[PDB]
């Protein structure tokens, strides 16, 4: 139900940075709670 079977950005070990960042490494199998923030590794 939705798109895929991703996990929580805080459930594993990630962070939510600004989508307009220049130094953000987007990680899969996980998403952010905000609709304007991406779940990056660090």
Short mmCIF file of N, CA and C in Angstrom, two decimals:
data_model
loop_
_atom_site.label_atom_id
_atom_site.label_comp_id
_atom_site.label_asym_id
_atom_site.label_seq_id
_atom_site.Cartn_x
_atom_site.Cartn_y
_atom_site.Cartn_z
N UNK A 1 0.84 -1.22 0.00
CA UNK A 1 0.00 0.00 0.00
C UNK A 1 0.86 1.26 0.00
N UNK A 2 0.86 1.97 -1.12
CA UNK A 2 1.65 3.19 -1.25
C UNK A 2 2.54 3.14 -2.49
N UNK A 3 3.82 2.89 -2.28
CA UNK A 3 4.78 2.82 -3.38
C UNK A 3 5.62 1.55 -3.28
N UNK A 4 6.31 1.38 -2.15
CA UNK A 4 7.15 0.22 -1.93
C UNK A 4 7.09 -0.21 -0.47
N UNK A 5 8.10 -0.97 -0.04
CA UNK A 5 8.16 -1.45 1.34
C UNK A 5 9.37 -0.86 2.06
N UNK A 6 9.57 0.45 1.90
CA UNK A 6 10.69 1.13 2.53
C UNK A 6 10.56 1.11 4.05
N UNK A 7 11.58 1.61 4.74
CA UNK A 7 11.58 1.64 6.19
C UNK A 7 11.68 3.08 6.70
N UNK A 8 11.77 3.23 8.02
CA UNK A 8 11.87 4.55 8.63
C UNK A 8 13.32 5.03 8.66
N UNK A 9 13.51 6.32 8.43
CA UNK A 9 14.85 6.91 8.42
C UNK A 9 15.49 6.80 9.80
N UNK A 10 14.67 6.75 10.84
CA UNK A 10 15.17 6.65 12.21
C UNK A 10 15.13 5.20 12.70
N UNK A 11 14.40 4.35 11.98
CA UNK A 11 14.28 2.95 12.36
C UNK A 11 15.62 2.23 12.20
N UNK A 12 16.39 2.63 11.19
CA UNK A 12 17.69 2.02 10.94
C UNK A 12 18.81 2.90 11.48
N UNK A 13 19.13 3.97 10.77
CA UNK A 13 20.19 4.89 11.18
C UNK A 13 20.49 5.91 10.09
N UNK A 14 19.60 6.89 9.93
CA UNK A 14 19.79 7.91 8.92
C UNK A 14 19.40 9.28 9.42
N UNK A 15 19.37 10.24 8.51
CA UNK A 15 19.01 11.62 8.85
C UNK A 15 18.14 12.24 7.77
N UNK A 16 17.44 13.32 8.12
CA UNK A 16 16.58 14.01 7.17
C UNK A 16 17.13 15.40 6.86
N UNK A 17 17.75 15.53 5.69
CA UNK A 17 18.32 16.81 5.27
C UNK A 17 17.43 17.50 4.25
N UNK A 18 17.75 18.76 3.95
CA UNK A 18 16.99 19.53 2.99
C UNK A 18 17.16 18.98 1.58
N UNK A 19 16.05 18.90 0.86
CA UNK A 19 16.06 18.39 -0.51
C UNK A 19 16.88 19.29 -1.44
N UNK A 20 17.17 20.51 -0.98
CA UNK A 20 17.93 21.46 -1.79
C UNK A 20 19.40 21.48 -1.38
N UNK A 21 19.86 20.41 -0.73
CA UNK A 21 21.23 20.32 -0.30
C UNK A 21 22.13 19.86 -1.43
N UNK A 22 23.39 20.22 -1.33
CA UNK A 22 24.38 19.88 -2.32
C UNK A 22 25.27 18.73 -1.85
N UNK A 23 25.23 18.44 -0.56
CA UNK A 23 26.04 17.37 0.01
C UNK A 23 25.16 16.37 0.77
N UNK A 24 24.29 15.69 0.04
CA UNK A 24 23.40 14.70 0.64
C UNK A 24 23.39 13.40 -0.16
N UNK A 25 23.71 12.30 0.51
CA UNK A 25 23.73 10.99 -0.13
C UNK A 25 22.42 10.24 0.15
N UNK A 26 21.45 10.31 -0.78
CA UNK A 26 20.15 9.64 -0.62
C UNK A 26 20.29 8.13 -0.53
N UNK A 27 19.66 7.55 0.49
CA UNK A 27 19.70 6.10 0.69
C UNK A 27 18.34 5.48 0.41
N UNK A 28 18.35 4.24 -0.09
CA UNK A 28 17.11 3.54 -0.40
C UNK A 28 16.59 2.78 0.82
N UNK A 29 15.59 1.93 0.59
CA UNK A 29 14.99 1.14 1.66
C UNK A 29 14.72 1.98 2.90
N UNK A 30 14.35 3.24 2.69
CA UNK A 30 14.06 4.14 3.80
C UNK A 30 13.61 5.50 3.29
N UNK A 31 12.71 6.14 4.04
CA UNK A 31 12.18 7.45 3.67
C UNK A 31 12.07 8.35 4.90
N UNK A 32 11.78 9.62 4.67
CA UNK A 32 11.64 10.59 5.76
C UNK A 32 10.18 10.82 6.10
N UNK A 33 9.95 11.40 7.27
CA UNK A 33 8.59 11.68 7.73
C UNK A 33 8.04 12.95 7.09
N UNK A 34 8.94 13.86 6.72
CA UNK A 34 8.53 15.12 6.10
C UNK A 34 8.45 14.98 4.58
N UNK A 35 7.56 15.76 3.97
CA UNK A 35 7.38 15.72 2.52
C UNK A 35 8.29 16.73 1.82
N UNK A 36 9.28 17.24 2.55
CA UNK A 36 10.21 18.21 1.99
C UNK A 36 11.64 17.92 2.45
N UNK A 37 11.85 16.71 2.97
CA UNK A 37 13.15 16.30 3.46
C UNK A 37 13.51 14.92 2.93
N UNK A 38 14.79 14.71 2.62
CA UNK A 38 15.25 13.43 2.11
C UNK A 38 16.02 12.66 3.18
N UNK A 39 15.92 11.34 3.13
CA UNK A 39 16.61 10.48 4.09
C UNK A 39 17.99 10.11 3.56
N UNK A 40 19.00 10.79 4.07
CA UNK A 40 20.38 10.56 3.66
C UNK A 40 21.11 9.68 4.67
N UNK A 41 22.26 9.16 4.27
CA UNK A 41 23.06 8.30 5.14
C UNK A 41 23.48 9.05 6.39
N UNK A 42 24.08 10.23 6.20
CA UNK A 42 24.53 11.05 7.32
C UNK A 42 24.10 12.50 7.14
#
